[PDB]
Design an enzyme around this catalytic site. Sequence first.
Site, PDB file in Angstrom:
ATOM      1  N   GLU A 119      23.498  18.280  21.345  1.00 52.10           N
ATOM      2  CA  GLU A 119      24.912  17.958  21.522  1.00 52.10           C
ATOM      3  C   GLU A 119      24.986  16.438  21.679  1.00 52.10           C
ATOM      4  N   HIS A 176      28.095   6.658  52.065  1.00 50.29           N
ATOM      5  CA  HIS A 176      28.872   6.366  53.260  1.00 50.29           C
ATOM      6  C   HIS A 176      28.191   5.460  54.291  1.00 50.29           C
ATOM      7  N   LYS A 189      45.304   7.484  43.613  1.00 47.53           N
ATOM      8  CA  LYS A 189      44.670   6.819  42.468  1.00 47.53           C
ATOM      9  C   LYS A 189      43.710   7.763  41.747  1.00 47.53           C
ATOM     10  N   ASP A 190      42.907   8.506  42.507  1.00 51.61           N
ATOM     11  CA  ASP A 190      41.966   9.457  41.920  1.00 51.61           C
ATOM     12  C   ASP A 190      42.684  10.623  41.233  1.00 51.61           C
ATOM     13  N   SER A 192      31.688   1.741  49.820  1.00 52.54           N
ATOM     14  CA  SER A 192      31.743   1.351  48.419  1.00 52.54           C
ATOM     15  C   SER A 192      31.571  -0.141  48.176  1.00 52.54           C
TER      16      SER A 192
HETATM   17  C1  HEM Z   1      26.674  21.652  36.197  1.00 50.73           C
HETATM   18  C2  HEM Z   1      27.452  22.824  35.639  1.00 50.73           C
HETATM   19  C3  HEM Z   1      27.220  23.446  34.425  1.00 50.73           C
HETATM   20  C4  HEM Z   1      27.006  22.881  33.173  1.00 50.73           C
HETATM   21  C5  HEM Z   1      26.715  21.422  32.764  1.00 50.73           C
HETATM   22  C6  HEM Z   1      27.108  23.996  32.248  1.00 50.73           C
HETATM   23  C7  HEM Z   1      26.898  23.866  30.908  1.00 50.73           C
HETATM   24  C8  HEM Z   1      26.776  24.924  30.030  1.00 50.73           C
HETATM   25  C9  HEM Z   1      26.553  24.764  28.630  1.00 50.73           C
HETATM   26  C10 HEM Z   1      26.351  23.458  27.876  1.00 50.73           C
HETATM   27  C11 HEM Z   1      26.661  25.980  28.117  1.00 50.73           C
HETATM   28  C12 HEM Z   1      26.707  26.358  26.671  1.00 50.73           C
HETATM   29  C13 HEM Z   1      28.133  26.264  26.180  1.00 50.73           C
HETATM   30  C14 HEM Z   1      28.262  26.682  24.734  1.00 50.73           C
HETATM   31  O1  HEM Z   1      28.479  27.893  24.485  1.00 50.73           O
HETATM   32  O2  HEM Z   1      28.122  25.793  23.855  1.00 50.73           O
HETATM   33  C15 HEM Z   1      26.908  26.888  29.186  1.00 50.73           C
HETATM   34  C16 HEM Z   1      27.073  28.246  29.022  1.00 50.73           C
HETATM   35  C17 HEM Z   1      27.146  29.143  30.023  1.00 50.73           C
HETATM   36  N1  HEM Z   1      27.172  28.788  31.363  1.00 50.73           N
HETATM   37 FE1  HEM Z   1      27.222  26.994  32.108  1.00 50.73          FE
HETATM   38  N2  HEM Z   1      27.224  25.226  32.888  1.00 50.73           N
HETATM   39  C18 HEM Z   1      27.313  24.888  34.210  1.00 50.73           C
HETATM   40  C19 HEM Z   1      27.455  25.803  35.213  1.00 50.73           C
HETATM   41  C20 HEM Z   1      27.484  27.166  35.085  1.00 50.73           C
HETATM   42  C21 HEM Z   1      27.524  28.090  36.201  1.00 50.73           C
HETATM   43  C22 HEM Z   1      27.674  27.735  37.698  1.00 50.73           C
HETATM   44  C23 HEM Z   1      27.393  29.328  35.648  1.00 50.73           C
HETATM   45  C24 HEM Z   1      27.273  30.554  36.287  1.00 50.73           C
HETATM   46  C25 HEM Z   1      27.971  30.944  37.599  1.00 50.73           C
HETATM   47  C26 HEM Z   1      27.418  29.138  34.232  1.00 50.73           C
HETATM   48  C27 HEM Z   1      27.353  30.160  33.345  1.00 50.73           C
HETATM   49  C28 HEM Z   1      27.249  30.003  32.007  1.00 50.73           C
HETATM   50  C29 HEM Z   1      27.274  31.114  31.071  1.00 50.73           C
HETATM   51  C30 HEM Z   1      27.506  32.595  31.404  1.00 50.73           C
HETATM   52  C31 HEM Z   1      27.169  30.572  29.821  1.00 50.73           C
HETATM   53  C32 HEM Z   1      27.083  31.397  28.542  1.00 50.73           C
HETATM   54  C33 HEM Z   1      28.354  31.706  27.764  1.00 50.73           C
HETATM   55  C34 HEM Z   1      28.780  30.561  26.884  1.00 50.73           C
HETATM   56  O3  HEM Z   1      27.948  30.113  26.065  1.00 50.73           O
HETATM   57  O4  HEM Z   1      29.936  30.104  26.998  1.00 50.73           O
HETATM   58  N3  HEM Z   1      27.425  27.802  33.880  1.00 50.73           N
HETATM   59  N4  HEM Z   1      26.936  26.240  30.376  1.00 50.73           N
HETATM   60  C1  HEM Z   2      26.672  15.086  40.095  1.00 47.54           C
HETATM   61  C2  HEM Z   2      27.036  13.703  39.605  1.00 47.54           C
HETATM   62  C3  HEM Z   2      27.525  12.716  40.448  1.00 47.54           C
HETATM   63  C4  HEM Z   2      28.502  12.861  41.376  1.00 47.54           C
HETATM   64  C5  HEM Z   2      29.179  14.150  41.794  1.00 47.54           C
HETATM   65  C6  HEM Z   2      28.696  11.525  41.928  1.00 47.54           C
HETATM   66  C7  HEM Z   2      29.632  11.245  42.896  1.00 47.54           C
HETATM   67  C8  HEM Z   2      29.855  10.015  43.436  1.00 47.54           C
HETATM   68  C9  HEM Z   2      31.055   9.692  44.178  1.00 47.54           C
HETATM   69  C10 HEM Z   2      32.224  10.636  44.477  1.00 47.54           C
HETATM   70  C11 HEM Z   2      30.999   8.351  44.384  1.00 47.54           C
HETATM   71  C12 HEM Z   2      32.041   7.506  45.032  1.00 47.54           C
HETATM   72  C13 HEM Z   2      33.207   6.993  44.183  1.00 47.54           C
HETATM   73  C14 HEM Z   2      32.759   6.179  42.986  1.00 47.54           C
HETATM   74  O1  HEM Z   2      32.361   5.005  43.158  1.00 47.54           O
HETATM   75  O2  HEM Z   2      32.800   6.715  41.866  1.00 47.54           O
HETATM   76  C15 HEM Z   2      29.746   7.898  43.877  1.00 47.54           C
HETATM   77  C16 HEM Z   2      29.300   6.623  44.006  1.00 47.54           C
HETATM   78  C17 HEM Z   2      28.136   6.173  43.456  1.00 47.54           C
HETATM   79  N1  HEM Z   2      27.330   6.958  42.642  1.00 47.54           N
HETATM   80 FE1  HEM Z   2      27.522   8.791  42.038  1.00 47.54          FE
HETATM   81  N2  HEM Z   2      27.783  10.588  41.431  1.00 47.54           N
HETATM   82  C18 HEM Z   2      27.072  11.302  40.511  1.00 47.54           C
HETATM   83  C19 HEM Z   2      26.019  10.799  39.809  1.00 47.54           C
HETATM   84  C20 HEM Z   2      25.515   9.546  39.956  1.00 47.54           C
HETATM   85  C21 HEM Z   2      24.602   8.900  39.027  1.00 47.54           C
HETATM   86  C22 HEM Z   2      23.903   9.532  37.852  1.00 47.54           C
HETATM   87  C23 HEM Z   2      24.396   7.633  39.455  1.00 47.54           C
HETATM   88  C24 HEM Z   2      23.540   6.617  38.934  1.00 47.54           C
HETATM   89  C25 HEM Z   2      22.138   6.903  38.408  1.00 47.54           C
HETATM   90  C26 HEM Z   2      25.240   7.534  40.644  1.00 47.54           C
HETATM   91  C27 HEM Z   2      25.408   6.365  41.334  1.00 47.54           C
HETATM   92  C28 HEM Z   2      26.342   6.092  42.273  1.00 47.54           C
HETATM   93  C29 HEM Z   2      26.377   4.855  42.999  1.00 47.54           C
HETATM   94  C30 HEM Z   2      25.341   3.752  42.924  1.00 47.54           C
HETATM   95  C31 HEM Z   2      27.537   4.844  43.668  1.00 47.54           C
HETATM   96  C32 HEM Z   2      28.041   3.608  44.384  1.00 47.54           C
HETATM   97  C33 HEM Z   2      29.379   3.197  43.824  1.00 47.54           C
HETATM   98  C34 HEM Z   2      29.863   1.850  44.339  1.00 47.54           C
HETATM   99  O3  HEM Z   2      30.539   1.829  45.393  1.00 47.54           O
HETATM  100  O4  HEM Z   2      29.570   0.816  43.695  1.00 47.54           O
HETATM  101  N3  HEM Z   2      25.985   8.658  40.878  1.00 47.54           N
HETATM  102  N4  HEM Z   2      29.095   8.896  43.166  1.00 47.54           N
HETATM  103  C1  LIG Z   3      17.879  24.481  24.345  1.00 45.86           C
HETATM  104  O1  LIG Z   3      18.095  23.244  23.646  1.00 45.86           O
HETATM  105  C2  LIG Z   3      19.329  22.777  23.940  1.00 45.86           C
HETATM  106  C3  LIG Z   3      19.837  21.480  23.309  1.00 45.86           C
HETATM  107  C4  LIG Z   3      21.138  20.879  23.824  1.00 45.86           C
HETATM  108  O2  LIG Z   3      21.717  20.052  23.121  1.00 45.86           O
HETATM  109  O3  LIG Z   3      21.734  21.194  25.000  1.00 45.86           O
HETATM  110  C5  LIG Z   3      23.104  20.824  25.318  1.00 45.86           C
HETATM  111  C6  LIG Z   3      19.141  20.881  22.221  1.00 45.86           C
HETATM  112  C7  LIG Z   3      19.499  21.363  20.906  1.00 45.86           C
HETATM  113  C8  LIG Z   3      18.866  20.832  19.744  1.00 45.86           C
HETATM  114  C9  LIG Z   3      17.872  19.818  19.872  1.00 45.86           C
HETATM  115  C10 LIG Z   3      17.505  19.328  21.152  1.00 45.86           C
HETATM  116  C11 LIG Z   3      18.117  19.836  22.348  1.00 45.86           C
HETATM  117  C12 LIG Z   3      17.746  19.331  23.602  1.00 45.86           C
HETATM  118  O4  LIG Z   3      17.403  17.926  23.631  1.00 45.86           O
HETATM  119  C13 LIG Z   3      17.069  17.341  24.811  1.00 45.86           C
HETATM  120  N1  LIG Z   3      17.190  17.980  26.020  1.00 45.86           N
HETATM  121  C14 LIG Z   3      16.859  17.393  27.209  1.00 45.86           C
HETATM  122  C15 LIG Z   3      16.998  18.111  28.444  1.00 45.86           C
HETATM  123  C16 LIG Z   3      16.634  17.448  29.657  1.00 45.86           C
HETATM  124  C17 LIG Z   3      16.146  16.087  29.625  1.00 45.86           C
HETATM  125  C18 LIG Z   3      15.764  15.402  30.939  1.00 45.86           C
HETATM  126  C19 LIG Z   3      16.004  15.365  28.393  1.00 45.86           C
HETATM  127  C20 LIG Z   3      16.363  16.029  27.179  1.00 45.86           C
HETATM  128  N2  LIG Z   3      16.243  15.397  25.969  1.00 45.86           N
HETATM  129  C21 LIG Z   3      16.575  15.999  24.779  1.00 45.86           C
HETATM  130  C22 LIG Z   3      16.409  15.226  23.449  1.00 45.86           C
HETATM  131  F1  LIG Z   3      17.559  15.211  22.783  1.00 45.86           F
HETATM  132  F2  LIG Z   3      16.038  13.971  23.693  1.00 45.86           F
HETATM  133  F3  LIG Z   3      15.479  15.801  22.686  1.00 45.86           F
END
Ligand code: HEM
Ligand code: HEM
Ligand SMILES: CO/C=C(/C(=O)OC)c1ccccc1COc1nc2ccc(C)cc2nc1C(F)(F)F
Lengths: 49, 80, 380, 61, 70, 241, 96
Positions: C272, C202, C228-229, C206
């Site tokens: 994954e 901000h 739009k969003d 943008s």
């Molecule tokens: C940035 C947000 C999050 C991401 C990227 C995320 C991602 C994941 C992933 C990749 C798994 C494994 C899914 C699978 O079974 O293959 C998982 C499982 C789980 N996550 Fe999250 N999670 C998020 C937030 C949360 C939050 C806020 C909670 C708790 C309040 C939560 C609770 C759990 C639990 C209980 C599981 C285990 C059960 C299951 O495997 O489905 N997660 N999460």
């Molecule tokens: C938790 C993940 C993220 C959230 C919630 C998020 C959210 C936002 C939001 C809502 C905007 C404004 C609308 C848009 O342009 O899409 C924004 C803009 C931006 N975000 Fe993120 N962002 C995330 C991760 C990142 C990552 C990983 C990068 C790059 C390493 C990044 C770079 C930017 C930049 C540079 C802008 C400027 C956009 C422009 O006006 O050109 N953000 N992001």
């Molecule tokens: C507990 O392990 C969880 C894995 C996964 O895929 O999570 C979604 C997983 C399963 C099999 C083999 C490898 C992984 C995790 O792999 C990674 N996990 C990473 C997690 C954090 C960061 C910063 C980099 C990572 N890089 C990697 C990489 F693929 F390169 F090995």
Amino acid sequence: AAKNVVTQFISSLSASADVLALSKIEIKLSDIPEGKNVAFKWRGKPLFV
Amino acid sequence: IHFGNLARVRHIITYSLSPFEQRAIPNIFSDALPNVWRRFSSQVFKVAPPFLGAYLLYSWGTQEFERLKRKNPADYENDQ
Amino acid sequence: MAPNIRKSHPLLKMINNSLIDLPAPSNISAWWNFGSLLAVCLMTQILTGLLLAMHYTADTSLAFSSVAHTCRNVQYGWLIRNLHANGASFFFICIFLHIGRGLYYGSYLYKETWNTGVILLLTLMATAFVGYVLPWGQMSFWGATVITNLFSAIPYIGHTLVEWAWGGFSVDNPTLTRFFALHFLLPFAIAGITIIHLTFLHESGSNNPLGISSDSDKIPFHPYYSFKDILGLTLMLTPFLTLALFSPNLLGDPENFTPANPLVTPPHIKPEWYFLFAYAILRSIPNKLGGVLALAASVLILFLIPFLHKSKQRTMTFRPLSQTLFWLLVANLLILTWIGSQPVEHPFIIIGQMASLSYFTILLILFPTIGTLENKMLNY
Amino acid sequence: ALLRQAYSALFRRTSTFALTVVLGAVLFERAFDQGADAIFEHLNEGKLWKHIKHKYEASEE
Amino acid sequence: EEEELVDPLTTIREHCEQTEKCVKARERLELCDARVSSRSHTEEQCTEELFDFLHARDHCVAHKLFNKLK
Amino acid sequence: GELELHPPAFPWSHGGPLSALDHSSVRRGFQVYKQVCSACHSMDYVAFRNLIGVTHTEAEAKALAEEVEVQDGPDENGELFMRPGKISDYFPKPYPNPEAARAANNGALPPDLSYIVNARHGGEDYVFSLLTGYCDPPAGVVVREGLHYNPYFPGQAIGMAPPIYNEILEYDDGTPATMSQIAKDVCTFLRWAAEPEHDQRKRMGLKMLLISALLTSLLYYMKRHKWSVLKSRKMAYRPPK
Amino acid sequence: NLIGVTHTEAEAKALAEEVEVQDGPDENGELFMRPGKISDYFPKPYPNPEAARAANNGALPPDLSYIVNARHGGEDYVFSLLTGYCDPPAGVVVRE
Ligand code: HEM
Ligand code: HEM
Ligand SMILES: CO/C=C(/C(=O)OC)c1ccccc1COc1nc2ccc(C)cc2nc1C(F)(F)F
Ligand code: HEC
Ligand SMILES: CCCCCCCCO[C@@H]1O[C@H](CO)[C@@H](O)[C@H](O)[C@H]1O
């Protein structure tokens, strides 16, 4: 859309199928002699019939 | 507060109509599509090339890998 | 006082000055829709995560079954589980396009917004990493084992940090319970930092596809971009849900429907889809430490992009050479992805080392070079 | 001219507009659900329990 | 027979082995088997050949088998 | 030795995105499991109550569960003890623990079948192809004693002897119990056990699609309608020139 | 836990070998006995409360791990009780 999704999630918090499975107990009266009392476990606590 | 301090602008007139006087999606065939094509055309040769070059690499390596699983009959000729 | 209570109120002034009267460029394309999606996605992951956490049990003897119980017994538990696991994917698809857009249109020139972006990426990656361990299936255990074991390749402080992180001698219960806690925690930090991300943004406002001042043509975020969003949301959401409800196990590894077993190493340990490209780069350099460093840099390299900008123009819209180089890079990534899912054998091993080599080359050498070259072709 | 009538009765006052959305939802749900299940079941004639149920529902032993 | 129970699989399996695809595959197997069976020293095995046959036969079976099952 | 044979793609009645499970085939599959597989394969995540309203009657299900003895306890003296089964009980385990399982199968361990179709690449196609794919090893290949040749199983030497053959059992609904028919049924049943939500999941997917189409449409108009003000806008530069 | 507190490492290992602990399963999936290790916990007198009561007239002798903090009085209460047994006053009858 909203009404259903919200419903679905709220439901997630109420009794699961396994818990409901122990909800009710059906006892056979045709196996309990006079006077003699019988206790059956119902919801963790004892049930006297 | 960001509206009013933005830029120094002079002598520009703009005209617009309420959305209720115009068509939401107008000139689909006479304008819309033609441009869709225009746009597609101008990018295809910048994007497509590398993706295609990847498809190949992918296709080759996938096959070349399977080929190395099949046997070479020229290892069992001197087996009598 | 102020006439309308949207300008004066210390809270409605905030909702207003960032979502209603916020000046946005009149021409940002659909590639500017990902920021909001990322946000909505985040709120969604948290909601479904809490719902799942309320039926989970962080213990090696109950983890696998508690999740099975959730799907089998909890009202709509299967659906909530599906949305969470697949939501993590959507999250990454969205984040990768968010980044791409930023690289193509030079948004990284907004350094603080960009650097916080990188931190969000890393936090999200660690979050999915620990979250993946929770169901405690074979891939959950071996992924955890293989990856966390790389730290012992660090000098001295290595063999320690590992057994400290594990809480023992191998990935076991103590590791599981601390992973549940971290997984429950990190998402909130993500939300936190996301606030910082939008604050820095901000300051400048943008960027836009042509890369030129949009001050002469700004428009109120609402209704233009709110509509739009919202549309952009439904557009993405349809495939997300379609794939989720019609092909639930499309993305998942079947090795995870089998309870973790320390005495049986799976034939092919792979992450994954969203981690594959990094896995490929990891395996490209044979030597435990050098592979770790190569993995580290594959992501930390993002902190350098802002400094390798040589063009006199902000975006690539008007730079045909950079455009193809850019798409080469994208395609370079599909290749690393593919390689990451293939076993360590010829021809994959060499294709892999090349793709890695080309990846860093394109970012550290070609891009800055072609930019310089392009300035001279404009007679600058 | 329904558009005209609808606009004057339903979409004019924000109060009637919201009231319309509610009854609209109420009616739409009831209808969309029946039609959806009807389509789903028809597409799966004889495979659901609902169908093969008669064979064991008071018609056995 | 007059009335016996037959596995529609074996029937369809037979009818399929008559495909040009199978016949050709089947033939290369019988050839491998023969030269392999007739050698006291040889690491060769007819897995690959067996697989191509089974792959073609079974492919064919799939498109027909379920039609004749409840 | 890195050769593997991949199963074909059978046209299951539940393969369509909107096509449910054939509950008659699932009911039969249960019998196959109850009367054949369950002698070696446990299915820890399914309970008799789960059959109710899916493939069986409530009366039927209660009976099936009473045909089994379950160990309950402790009692007053702190003693374990047997009791007839209830619909709230899970399918019975064949062995006390893996060690005992292997002991009764030559060191082999028959896996729990609850999530089998999702735990193996191929799903029901793999399980079906394996059950009906036993045959003799090709030339050059010797299977160690106790193991059996199966091309569909990795390594081709599987510790499971062909579990099914024609008429190995009889369906009380009178379906020709040929080998392939049986495998087909138990596989359908296995799909259900791995994911009971199958049908509901698809019924939802259908509703999700219609609403998704409807909403995406309406929002597209709305978006266009609002933006029309800018899309058609015209402008000119009028310096005092 | 006794090591370095009240006993020697040698002493503690001995104390633990004076006990038989049930381990298992083994190859055949059988439970089996084995001498104790310092990593084992103090042996339980009964398999479960039901068995405990059965051997104490329906009474259940509680686990003593947290006894002093589980009773108002602490060691004063436990001490006063151990050494405070006596005959009931007039009018008071204790069931058999
Ligand atoms: C940035 C947000 C999050 C991401 C990227 C995320 C991602 C994941 C992933 C990749 C798994 C494994 C899914 C699978 O079974 O293959 C998982 C499982 C789980 N996550 Fe999250 N999670 C998020 C937030 C949360 C939050 C806020 C909670 C708790 C309040 C939560 C609770 C759990 C639990 C209980 C599981 C285990 C059960 C299951 O495997 O489905 N997660 N999460
Ligand atoms: C938790 C993940 C993220 C959230 C919630 C998020 C959210 C936002 C939001 C809502 C905007 C404004 C609308 C848009 O342009 O899409 C924004 C803009 C931006 N975000 Fe993120 N962002 C995330 C991760 C990142 C990552 C990983 C990068 C790059 C390493 C990044 C770079 C930017 C930049 C540079 C802008 C400027 C956009 C422009 O006006 O050109 N953000 N992001
Ligand atoms: C507990 O392990 C969880 C894995 C996964 O895929 O999570 C979604 C997983 C399963 C099999 C083999 C490898 C992984 C995790 O792999 C990674 N996990 C990473 C997690 C954090 C960061 C910063 C980099 C990572 N890089 C990697 C990489 F693929 F390169 F090995
Ligand atoms: C005990 C004598 C068995 C009977 C009866 C059935 N199965 Fe079996 N099964 C058994 C063993 C000992 C094994 C081990 C195989 C190995 O070497 O690991 C198995 C394995 C399976 C598998 C596949 C295992 C894999 O792919 O890794 C499946 C899908 C399977 N068995 C299915 C199955 C079915 C459907 C049966 C009833 C029709 C059945 N088995 C009976 C032993 C025995
Ligand atoms: C894009 C948002 C789409 C939301 C679609 C909501 C449809 C989900 O509807 C669900 O259908 C099931 C099967 O009939 C029922 O059992 C559930 O109770 C019902 O909530």
